[PDB]
Ligand SMILES: *C[C@@](*)(O)[C@H](CCCNC(N)=[NH2+])NC(=O)[C@H](Cc1ccccc1)NC(=O)[C@H](N)Cc1ccccc1
Ligand SMILES: *[C@@H]1O[C@H](CO)[C@@H](O)[C@H](O)[C@H]1O
Ligand SMILES: *[C@@H]1O[C@@H](C)[C@@H](O)[C@@H](O)[C@@H]1O
Ligand SMILES: C[As](C)(=O)[O-]
Ligand SMILES: [Ca+2]
Ligand SMILES: [Ca+2]
Ligand SMILES: [Ca+2]
Ligand SMILES: [Ca+2]
């Protein structure tokens with residue numbers, strides 16, 4: 397028998413790193429602003445197409461929005477945030493993917509910053 | 513970036529960082545605060561690791577922080593889709609797809625063989641019983 | 655067999671029962687119409703070689719149906735390298751006096767080719783082990799053929815997952831571990847020579863022979879089986895060899 | 909021959925790569941992966957690389973727990 401070494405155990409669902417998210421868009425409706433997070437695709441395939449992060453984790457995945465003196469935060473269990481802003485002031489955004497039920501690697505890294 | 517007299521104008525992320533490349537300071541003049549500029553800087557300064565077009569064989573690259581991910585077409589694998597699934601037809605790979613015996617051959621495709629009492633079918637991989645009670649089969653279940 | 659279930663009649667058709675003077679001795683595996691594989695240690699204390707019988711198509715030892723077929727064992731071939739009282743090279747090839755008739759209840763188990771066994775069969779996790787051996791380390795033997803599904807381990811892992819004992823035999827390249835170390839399931843005394851059969855893409859092959867252990871289903875230990883793949887060339891050479899005179903024959907190995 | 913060491917899983921959005929050490933001097937590797945009760949499957953046959961992409965195997969069932977092992981063969 398060959399010389400070998402065992403690897404640590406690995407459960408994909410609980411341990412795979414969440415990739416850097418990207419803010420897809422954002423538009424105004426008077427005093428409210430809607431921020432949309434792009435549904436990042438994963439390597440998981442279902443009949444020849446790739447599943448999105450939302451398709452795989454469903455309700456286990458939430459997104460946190462950081463917007464801006466303090467930072468204000470909003471949370472959503474969909475890919476959209478609907479926040480109250482001020483008429484005339486320009487805001488900047490950054491999101492982070494989070495799976496709260498996780499023990500380790502619970503959060504992705506922050507997305508690139510986008511401003512109005 | 514900076515040209516003669518432009519810095520008389522107020523900072524603009526679009527004009528200075530999107531339409532042009534901006535230094536950390538130009539960014540700090542727009543964002544003002546340190547933690548905010550630092551956060552913008554991480555992703556802006558990171559660079560696009562997908563620039564080398566590392567994903568081979570028609571794969572798609574997705575940039576990440578100091579790395580990338582390659583999404584490969586169905587018949588490929590590897591960090592950069594460098595591995596051809598079809599080129600892996602050797603016996604150590606799922607027995608070369610042979611139902612019973614597999615024989616590796618350098619220079620040509622591998623071949624399948626069967627145990628006495630069986631003969632190789634036309635598909636080159638399956639075996640079929642030539643005798644009434646071949647070994648390894650349970651009659652009352654067949 | 656400790657912690658197994660009854661093998662439904664007909665579903666363990668290559669199982670052989672060996673009897674000496676009507677006494678249950680060991681198990682065996684039918685590999686064709688006249689040859690049976692078993693364990694060498696089963697014959698260490700045999701002195702009356704003419705009362706050695708192999709029964710095929712057996713299931714319930716308490717009653718006779720028309721499926722049993724008895725044949726006297728003409729020859730018992732063991733490796734010369736085997737030393738009675740030790741664990742290494744625990745395998746034996748038995749020639750039956752007359753071939754058995756293959757039926758729905760008597761079918762041989764395939765002896766595989768060496769490379770196929772080492773490269774493919776060795777990585778199928780579970781295999782079946784059967785016998786009429788003891789139901790508990792201390793217990794009685796079974797009246798109905800018992801069968802158990804056991805996972806195989808590579809020797810490195812077997813050594814690492816076993817409780818160390820001061821005078822335990824080394825697991826050699828001629829052996830392999832299979833089973834559970836939690837005291838639940840294992841083959842046992844009286845099961846020796848029985849088959850450790852591995853299923854691969856529709857056909858069953860012989861990969862091991864019940865050989866020894868450190869108690870039946872004792873916590874911290876696995877059952878040890880003879881690694882049949884190491885003997886395939888030896889077995890085939892002997893099956894096509896000139897039948898000689900005495901019952902016991904110590905054939906050179908390799 | 910030397911045994912591989914420091915086996916590490918690198919996974920982001922399910923693209924899963926196993927990496928290990930050392931760089932092979934006169935030896936090649938083969939990787940096997942399985943679920944606790946499944947058969948072992950071989951991958952990256954006789955590679956001189958010190959990484960192996962297992963993505964295609966693990967995405968078959970992302971909720972299962974996998975174990976992999978790296979064999980060192982003399983060459
Ligand atoms: C002849 C067979 O029936 C029998 C099968 C035992 C299977 N046991 C488990 N746990 N799966 N084998 C034995 O009885 C062997 C015979 C033997 C072989 C070599 C040397 C000495 C005896 N005996 C044992 O396995 C006993 N546990 C004794 C023993 C042998 C080797 C190491 C430690 C103890
Ligand atoms: C493309 O770019 C990445 C990051 O610099 C590198 O790792 C690859 O080797 C190159 O082809
Ligand atoms: C990116 O994804 C890969 C897998 C291919 O479908 C490419 O053509 C596409 O741009
Ligand atoms: C190495 As052991 C036969 O004690 O499991
Ligand atoms: Ca400028
Ligand atoms: Ca400027
Ligand atoms: Ca400026
Ligand atoms: Ca400009």
Ligand SMILES: [Ca+2]
Pocket residue numbers: 526527530531
């Ligand atoms: Ca512009």
Ligand SMILES: [Ca+2]
Pocket residue numbers: 537538541
């Ligand atoms: Ca300045």
Ligand SMILES: [Ca+2]
Pocket residue numbers: 519537538541
């Ligand atoms: Ca400036």
Ligand SMILES: [Ca+2]
Pocket residue numbers: 558559560561575576577578579
């Ligand atoms: Ca980048």
Ligand SMILES: [Ca+2]
Pocket residue numbers: 712713714715716717718719722
């Ligand atoms: Ca009976």
Ligand SMILES: [Cl-]
Pocket residue numbers: 842843866867868869870
């Ligand atoms: Cl024992």
